[PDB]
Amino acid sequence: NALEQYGIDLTRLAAEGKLDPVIGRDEEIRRVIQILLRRTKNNPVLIGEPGVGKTAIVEGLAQRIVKGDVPEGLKGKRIVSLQMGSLLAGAKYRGEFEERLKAVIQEVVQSQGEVILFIDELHTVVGAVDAGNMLKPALARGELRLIGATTLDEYREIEKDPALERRFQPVYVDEPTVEETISILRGLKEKYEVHHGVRISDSAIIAAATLSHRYITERRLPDKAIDLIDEAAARLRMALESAPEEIDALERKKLQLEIEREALSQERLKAIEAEIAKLTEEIAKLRAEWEREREILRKLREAQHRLDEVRREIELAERQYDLNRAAELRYGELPKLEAEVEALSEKLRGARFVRLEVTEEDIAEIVSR
């Protein structure tokens, strides 16, 4: 099956609730639906800078299809994202790539309008690695629909081809504002907390949006803001795995006294031998206290993962209109897991060694580099 070998089925991933939430972009999703439902030039091409959210728009659409929140003409449709890496992989001889892509196109044509092909980085497929000829007839006859994604400066070149400009409909995707980015981050926050096993403050989110907008001009919202949060969460996770600085400070202080004892005056020996024992004893106490905190962190993390699955189960039940199951979870397991997550988080707020929450300070530090 060429479609599965060389594509990822975004509607299947949406049905299994495996795509991240898509926040806003309602206007852009409606526009794509509207174009797909025309008889001619019904192949929308998302045009916008890298990281702006073109792929997320297509994923939002797959979600709407699977829920059935689409007009009649799009009910039951699949969106398959073409995988250029899979097509090129092990294609050593001329004719292999071309044969693979024709198998994919043939399967799309065979589906009789039920499969819509999403082609990210469209310019890499049509233009000077050249496969425009293989798609053109199917487009012309209306037997194949596609969604494209590309940048403006590269669409300028695709547009020069007169056959394609009548088939494709440009959709210009602007970068979200700081406000919209904050909303996007708030919507994605739980995924990052669950993955990294940490918590992320709202002010860290505000800072990631604001500081990336202001200082990281060579990249786009919301990607750069998400990246700042992701990196800050990964670093806090890594810091939580390592020995805390306070236990580390005693440990290095002990080593100095151990090196100093190699030099040695009797009163100076007995005072430091007694000091090494005190530090050994202190390290022992704080290490046990740290293990305790670490096990509360483990429980919090288990509770986070369970909460995340329960939300997916709720979302899935709602889409299926299994109203009993949705209510069973919403009024039972959900508030139970939510209270456990909050209570364990609060316990860690008064922790000696575990700092659980990513702060605006963490964000500012990455932005400086």
Q: Which residues does the annotation place in the binding site? A: 48-55
Q: Which residues does a gap of C–N over 2.5 Å follow in the chain?
A: 128, 264
> Interface with ligand ADP includes 354 (CB under 6 A)?
no
DSSP sequence for 10-66: HHHHHHTT-SPP--S-HHHHHHHHHHHTSSSS-EEEEE--TTSSHHHHHHHHHHHHH
Which residue number is nearest to ligand ADP in terms of Cβ? Answer: 53
> Interface with ligand ADP includes 317 (CB under 6 A)?
no
Task: Give the gyration radius of the chain's Cα atoms.
Answer: 28
Q: Name which of ligand ADP, Cl ion, none residue 26 binds, using a CB cut-off of 5 to 8 Å depending on partner kind.
A: Cl ion
Give the residue with the Cβ less far from ligand ADP, 8 or 348: 8
> Interface with Cl ion includes 153 (CB under 5 A)?
no
In DSSP terms, 80 is beta-bridged to 9, 117
Give the residue with the Cβ less far from Cl ion, 60 or 127: 60
- 217 class by beta-carbon count within 10 Å (0-12 exposed, 13-18 middle, 19+ buried): exposed
Please check whether residue 183 is in contact with residue 23, taking contact to mean a CB–CB distance below 8 angstroms: yes
**Which 196-235 residues touch ligand ADP, going by CB under 6 A?**
222-223, 226
> Interface with ligand ADP includes 148 (CB under 6 A)?
no
Q: Name which of ligand ADP, Cl ion, none residue 25 binds, using a CB cut-off of 5 to 8 Å depending on partner kind.
A: ligand ADP
CB of 58 to ligand ADP, least distance (A): 8
Binding residues for ATP: 48-55
**Which 268-297 residues touch ligand ADP, going by CB under 6 A?**
none
Per-residue mark of binding to Cl ion, 8-47 (x: CB under 5 A)? ------------------x---------------------
Please check whether residue 311 is in contact with residue 334, taking contact to mean a CB–CB distance below 8 angstroms: yes
Question: How many residues of this chain bind ligand ADP (CB under 6 A)?
Answer: 21
Query: How far apart are the C-alpha atoms of 94 and 147, rounded to whole Å?
Result: 27
Give the residue with the Cβ less far from Cl ion, 35 or 122: 35
> Interface with ligand ADP includes 99 (CB under 6 A)?
no
Please check whether residue 17 is in contact with residue 312, taking contact to mean a CB–CB distance below 8 angstroms: yes
Rounded to the nearest 5°, which phi and psi values hold at 117?
-90, 120
Q: Name which of ligand ADP, Cl ion, none residue 55 binds, using a CB cut-off of 5 to 8 Å depending on partner kind.
A: ligand ADP
DSSP count for the chain of H helices, then E strands: 17, 8
Query: How far apart are the C-alpha atoms of 340 and 296, rounded to whole Å?
Result: 11
**Which 34-73 residues touch ligand ADP, going by CB under 6 A?**
48, 50-56
Binding site for ligand ADP (CB under 6 A): 20-25, 48, 50-56, 149, 184, 187-188, 222-223, 226
